[PDB]
Structure formats: C-alpha cells, structure tokens
Amino acid sequence: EIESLARYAVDEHNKKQNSLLQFEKVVNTKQQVVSGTIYIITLEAVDGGKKKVYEAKVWEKPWMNFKELQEFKLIGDAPS
Amino acid sequence: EIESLARYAVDEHNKKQNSLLQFEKVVNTKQQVVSGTIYIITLEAVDGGKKKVYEAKVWEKPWMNFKELQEFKLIGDAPS
16 A cells, blocks of 8 residues: 555655665655646746747646646747 | 736746746646645655655555655654
8 A cells, every 4th residue: 555655755766866765664644635727838938038938837726725836847939 | 817827837937046037928728637645654764774764745646557756855863
C-alpha cells in the first residue's frame, strides 16, 4: 500500500540528486483528496519590449478561493 | 474568468524571478480535472549511515497507474 509510494518517493528523490537514501519505514501518512481544475493557459506577454508566448499551468479550487501556479514556461517569440 | 488566472500566473512568475513580463492576452486554455490522492508520508531513511526523517508528498491516481512525487524534504535526524 503506502510503503510502495514511500519507496517510489525515495527512489525518485535519489534519482534526482544521485543520493542513496536507504528507505527504512513509513512512520505515518496523511492523505488529502485532490480536486479542482488545472488550467493550461497559453498567453502572450511582453518581455523587454518583445511580445512572447508562454504556457502557464494554474490549479484552482474556486469554492475555496484557492489558486496555485504549478508551472510557467516560455513557448517562443511572437512574429516579428 | 480565465484572464484573472493568467494575470495571476504572470504576477507569480514575475514575483519569483523579479521579471516584468507584461501580460497581453490569453490565446487558449486547456483544462484538466484534478483528482486522486496526495499522500503526505513521514518516513525514516538512512543517509550516509545516519537515520533521518523525511516528508514526501506523492500524488496518486491508481485507476490510471499514475504516481508523481510532488515534494520531498528533510525533517531531521532520528535520535542518536
């Protein structure tokens, strides 16, 4: 059950930074139901005088007045 | 509607790196329903011979065989 997710977490953490944390045991797990919407927004914005295109991923739970930026990247220049 | 989330995204991005991207417009939005469970796992793992305590946040959508590590941090040393 949860031990598999904990080993995965350690494995992924180790793979990220080339560490060798050696999983021992789960102490306790809390769990949170995940809900709401992710908006994958393609948008235009001007950067130093040049218009460019970006992609933003924003998580919203509007009934809670909650929003959180998840990811934001440059797509490329708008046409010259 | 979506323009507010796009301005928030640009605002949060700007606040992160002290840039002044100037939002122009939304081109298109895709949206994805967010579901599944986040497990906040407190676990013990050994690092260079010393047992320590970590917190991992793992998102699971088991009906899709999906899992994703969201966050992983050191809590502290186990007792000496």
